[PDB]
Amino acid sequence: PGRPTVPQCCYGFCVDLLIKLAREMDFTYEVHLVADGKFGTQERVNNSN
Amino acid sequence: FPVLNIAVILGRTRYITERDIRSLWTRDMSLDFDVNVVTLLVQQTDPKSIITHVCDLMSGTKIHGVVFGDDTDQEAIAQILDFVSSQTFIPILGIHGGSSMIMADKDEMSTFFQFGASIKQQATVMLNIMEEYDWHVFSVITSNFPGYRDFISFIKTTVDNSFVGWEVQNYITLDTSYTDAQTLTQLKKIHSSVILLYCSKDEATYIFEEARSLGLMGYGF
Amino acid sequence: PKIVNIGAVLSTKKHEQIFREAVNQANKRHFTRKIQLNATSVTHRPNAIQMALSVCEDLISSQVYAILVSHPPAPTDHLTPTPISYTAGFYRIPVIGLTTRMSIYSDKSIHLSFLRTVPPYSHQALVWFEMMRLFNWNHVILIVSDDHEGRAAQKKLETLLEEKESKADKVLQFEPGTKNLTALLLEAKELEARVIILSASEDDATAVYKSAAMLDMTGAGYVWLVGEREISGSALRYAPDGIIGLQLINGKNESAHISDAVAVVAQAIHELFEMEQITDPPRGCVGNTNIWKTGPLFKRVLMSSKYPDGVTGRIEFNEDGDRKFAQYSIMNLQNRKLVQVGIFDGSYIIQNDRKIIWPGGETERPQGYQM
Amino acid sequence: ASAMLEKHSVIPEAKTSCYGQNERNDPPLHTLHNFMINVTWDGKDLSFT
Ligand SMILES: *[C@@H]1O[C@H](CO)[C@@H](O[C@@H]2O[C@H](CO)[C@@H](O)[C@H](O)[C@H]2NC(C)=O)[C@H](O)[C@H]1NC(C)=O
Structure with missing residues (x-):
């Protein structure tokens, strides 16, 4: 109910793709899910707007 | 007890004496808090006259607070007194006319500030009028004085909410330095319902002359 | 011949004498018969709000057709010549600064009557873009103080970049007077760009x-x-x-x-x-609330006034009014001392014979993308 | 003043305005000019912008 960063295990199509790239691609990967619930969209920043 | 030191100045072409209101305010002033008042008046406004006089009264007596009164609406005046405020750090305010008239963004050091209002807000007032009868405003132009850049943003901020269906057609600047024509030919391009003006009355005078030639004076503008 | 007064505020009486001397030379330089020139100046005693008093009392009362101004030898704060631009502003009297290269008075919406020959610190970015251009690093980081100065520099450089695909990666703003600033650099290490x-x-x-x-x-x-x-x-x-x-x-x-x-x-x-x-x-x-109608016209002609030959170098002014084609001398820190590796004039850099120095001592260090 | 002076603050005089460049004996310490921007008077809501 209270949400705070948490270490988790994630497995996916996009993950298999990412590692496929990682073998194909030299770059090494560390993944953390975004805190924001939505991917997000450009929006007015309250008072800043 | 505290016996504060205060000064007020009435400048005018309309008849009243500071004395009249002096004693009045001290009577009204009397019960709420201690106050010591020196009143002075000067007939017509000048950068030199005002600066000299205010320094002349302030230095002689260690006044802590003052106000300003005038029967004139000159635009530059506010800034001048504001400039004095940045250096002095003495609170100042004004109750009528030009001092009450709006001024450019206040400096980091606090200045005198009664005339100023959020131009943005002022525009939102105007927008309320626009909301009732105005949509797709003909033009907003940063022609002269303070906030040419500043006014420009807010229109965007107003438009940015995108709560309703807002839009702009004309968005340019300029006036006096070259042929009015570069701005004018651009202005000819816009075809909209309400002209938005952010220029001084002096500029405006010329703008009036521009609009008649322009055809802005005609219905739908 | 009507002596057309001129006025100025300068650092010292010696420079006042220099001013008057140049003015006297002036009759020979621009047809003598058409104009007469008289010189008036002040040695700028440091009264914050009284020098201006006298400027109005003396110089405005003297109706100078123009005023020259220089940065005071003694240094107090910065951008002292704020008041005059406002004060003459009612007068619509052209002002010419000699030493004000600062960009604070760039805000001609309130400094409309203000003018200068030297380019501001912001315009220095013209060099950097050219510098960036040569070495082919498109990726950089910008660290600015937070004020009209820094933000203006950022705007100018970014505007330069706008012609290109806008390049805004890693802009970094810090606020002046701050002793603790390390925390931000820890953030800076993460960014890919190394310049x-x-x-x-x-x-x-x-x-x-x-x-x-x-x-x-x-x-x-x-x-x-x-x-x-x-x-x-x-x-x-x-x-x-x-x-x-x-x-x-x-x-x-x-x-x-x-x-x-x-x-x-x-x-x-x-x-x-x-x-x-x-x-x-x-x-x-006294008795005045009105502008001077001509001033804008004087500005309009003066945009095209041409005096490329000059003691300072070529002279031309853009729409903004800031000087153009300013020349800078690039400097290097070799052996913890300042040396001229090259000199920059016009739109093109010039390479002096001196050897290039970089962090780590490599003769050439072009690569900025370690990633 | 009742909100500044009475509430543990000193309301300093202008002191120096027309001479030299001495920084006016520095800025007044704890001047507290802008502590209140939303006040009333006679019950009038004269809160300020
Ligand atoms: C700035 O200009 C002054 C005056 O023109 C220069 O002072 C001269 O210096 C030269 C040195 O070669 C002397 O021969 C002259 O007697 C000095 N006064 C003159 C020329 O009348 C000064 O050198 C210049 N500043 C710099 C850094 O060069």
Whole structure:
């Protein structure tokens, strides 16, 4: 109910793709899910707007 | 007890004496808090006259607070007194006319500030009028004085909410330095319902002359 | 011949004498019969709000057709010549600064009557883009103080980049007077780009280098580009090696800068005199609330006044009014001392014979993308 | 003043305005000019912008 960063295990199509790239691609990967619930969209920043 | 030191100045072409209101305010002033008042008046406004006089009264007596009164609406005046405020750090305010008239963004050091209002807000007032009868405003132009850049943003901020269906057609600047024509030919391009003006009355005078030639004076503008 | 007064505020009485001398030379330079020139000036006693009093009392009362101004030898705060631009503003009297290269008065919406020959610190970015252009690093980082100065520099450089695909990666804003600044650099390490450019005051710059050295930012594979102010003053004593730097040409000499402005102004007024219905600047501070109609016209002709030959160098002004084609001398920190690796004039850089220095001592250090 | 002076603050005089450049004996310490921007008078809501 209270949400705070948490270490988790994630497995996916996009993950298999990412590692496929990682073998194909030299770059090494560390993944953390975004805190924001939505991917997000450009929006007015309250008072800043 | 505290016996504060205060000064007020009435400048005018309309008849009243500071004395009249002096004693009045001290009577009204009397019960709420201690106050010591020196009143002075000067007939017509000048950068030199005002600066000299205010320094002349302030230095002689260690006044802590003052106000300003005038029967004139000159635009530059506010800034001048504001400039004095940045250096002095003495609170100042004004109750009528030009001092009450709006001024450019206040400096980091606090200045005198009664005339100023959020131009943005002022525009939102105007927008309320626009909301009732105005949509797709003909033009907003940063022609002269303070906030040419500043006014420009807010229109965007107003438009940015995108709560309703807002839009702009004309968005340019300029006036006096070259042929009015570069701005004018651009202005000819816009075809909209309400002209938005952010220029001084002096500029405006010329703008009036521009609009008649322009055809802005005609219905739908 | 009507002596057309001129007025000025200058550092010292000797420079006043220099002014009067140049003015007297003036009759020979621009047809003598058409105009008469008289010189008036002040030695700028440091009264914050009274010198201006006298400017109005004396100079406005003297109806000077124009005023010259220079930065005071004694240094108090910065951008002291704020009041005059406002005060003459009612007068609509052209002002010409000799020493004000600062960008604070760039805001012509309130500094409308204001003018100068030297380019501001913001315009230095013209060099950096050209510098960036040569070396082919599209990826950089910008560190600016938070004020009209830094933000203006950012706007200018970004505007330069706008013609290209906009390049805004890693802009970094810090606020002046801050001693603790290391935390931000820890954030800076994460960014891919390895080239850095910064603008700040000398006092702040000490703190910047002090904090940067702690995190070992200066190391090879990193590049530093900077403003004239940064290389100067206390900034040097705790400072790093192999960092590019800039110095405006002719900054040191005020009298030299002044002779040139007057010759240039002379073209503006003499040419201006021929035009019909000109009005004298408002006579007497008192009794006036109205502008001077001509001033904008004087500005319009003066945009095209041409005096490329000059003591200071070529002279032309853009729509903004800031000088054009300014020349800077690139500086290097070799052996913890300032040296000219090259000199920059016009739109093209020039390479002096001196060997290039970089962080780590490599002769050439082009690659900025370690990733 | 009742909100500043009465509430542990000193309301300093202007002191120096027309001479030299001495920084006016520095800025007044704890001047507290802008502590209140939303006040009333006679019950009038004269809160300020
Ligand atoms: C700034 O200009 C002054 C005056 O023109 C220069 O002072 C001269 O220096 C030269 C040195 O070669 C002397 O021969 C002259 O007697 C000095 N006064 C003159 C020329 O009348 C000064 O050198 C210039 N500043 C710099 C850094 O060059």
